[PDB]
Amino acid sequence: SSDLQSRKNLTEEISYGLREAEQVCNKQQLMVESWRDFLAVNGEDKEEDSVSDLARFCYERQKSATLSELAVSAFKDAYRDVQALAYRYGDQSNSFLIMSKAGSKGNIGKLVQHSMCIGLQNSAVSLSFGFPRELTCAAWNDPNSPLRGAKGKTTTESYVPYGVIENSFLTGLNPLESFVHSVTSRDSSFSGNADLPGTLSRRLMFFMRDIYAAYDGTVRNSFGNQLVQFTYETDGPVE
């Protein structure tokens, strides 16, 4: 930001963009077979009830995996516009913008997390708790929040965590937001899937080692001169 007023304008703009993205996700969640009567062009008196239940959408999203995927896709689609604000509020001499445009290191999303907001934070694995849509001190003390085991809406056994962090790294993170970020990023530090590429490479090498090209132009295996390919199927240009 050039000055304090620009920073305040950017903060308000980011907040409004996040609210709009959340509303877009809530609208996209309705694309299910249970709301076909409401989505049709008719006269329904339950229009206000769809928008009055704001906290129930988060609970429904965390319990359902398809709804979670749809919400994630909608949030990314809406958050592209939010990420686009860096070019409007960024100077040409900014080192982060220069390195992002040049492609040497980083990208636009990393700069957005640095300055404007971290954004969506979701975990692939299923957990017993859920983020209560706000990431504030009051939310952490709510007995009915998804973080406190279950919301009682009959109990729940597993959750797909889904949280949005309004703050950024520069502004700092409250302990609940830091906890959410740690839960999201804990999967990277695991040692899983470190042996699978090696084992797959070893097996594929064992299968493909004996293959070689012959003088006659055919692709033959070492064992018994077995014909794998009569001619190399490459689209040129040197044989």
Partner: protein, 428 residues
Amino acid sequence: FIVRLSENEKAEDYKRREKVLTVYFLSTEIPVWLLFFALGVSSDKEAMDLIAFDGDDASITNSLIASIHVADAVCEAFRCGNNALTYVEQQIKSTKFPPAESVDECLHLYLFPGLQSLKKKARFLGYMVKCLLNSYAGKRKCENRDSFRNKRIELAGELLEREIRVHLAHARRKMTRAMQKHLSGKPIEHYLDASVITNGLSRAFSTGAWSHPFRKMERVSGVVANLGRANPLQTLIDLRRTRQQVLYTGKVGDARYPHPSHWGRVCFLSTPDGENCGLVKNMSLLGLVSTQSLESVVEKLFACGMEELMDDTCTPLFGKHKVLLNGDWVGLCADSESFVAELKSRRRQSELPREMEIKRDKDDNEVRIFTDAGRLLRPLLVVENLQKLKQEKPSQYPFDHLLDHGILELIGIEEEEDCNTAWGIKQL
């Protein structure tokens, strides 16, 4: 004591294979209703009232009816006389390792030792079956191993205790073998071998293989570690760690991820990276581990207003909430809110142990009290008596004075969820 709900596989035809309730006590596999009628119950309606499901579910009713029918088929006329007691005695005697005591004595001491009366343990069994049915119906959530509310930690009081016990048992076996060899055919000092326990402890500390908590063989590893002298920070953080044992490392579950129960007890931002990612957890700065209290809080609980549990099973509990102390149904309370408030007030006046968790959950309609060891505690400011601090006369208050005057208190993980906590003074 295990109560299992599963489809019947004994003396059951193809058509009738619905879920029934069974009791696994001393590997006897006895029907639940036979045990109910053996424990001073003479009516089906009374047994149903003991299991206060308080709901309308077809599966639960079908399971109860199936259990009744299985109990009737297994033992003829079990309700009349004491046929159920004879049947359970025969089942106990049928075990490969039957207890020496009789049925009239085994039930008193091998079944719910906390409850002295024979009818009270029937009510406890009814409560257990009610909890199982509520969990099956989905009203009650199941216990999770990841949460710290259901976990305890032992550092030296218990880890060394089992090694001492097993080495003492081995020494006793060797001593009695030597005595039998010598008697048939000496100072008492010669009979007892002193090198046994010393060598066992030395080997356990050196090799690092500690005795398994539940298995005689298959000694566990990772209990004893070397200290780091590179810098004082390394030896400070090595002394303050918590280990979670898992059979295999690649497949563990949700134990590698942070949990809301970790708030303030163990650090969630710093965990080792690698195979033991999340299994080893560093304790927080304000982290304390509870210890067993010599004093008994049972006598003080009755002074607050708690009443004794009804011995007769016929008398129902209208609105009296259950009071549980270390898993024992000590008594009942008419109103949970005032009872918990008075208990907390007594604790703040140093009239109760400073390491005690008071839990009140309205969903289960019970009051839960814990005073055992292994619980993780942290100090939190109390705003009710925070104005008492502003005396302006003293300065540099010792922590003991603050605890005695009630400005600060130790809050358990289970108790923290009940109370409302402020993050900062400015927000307060």
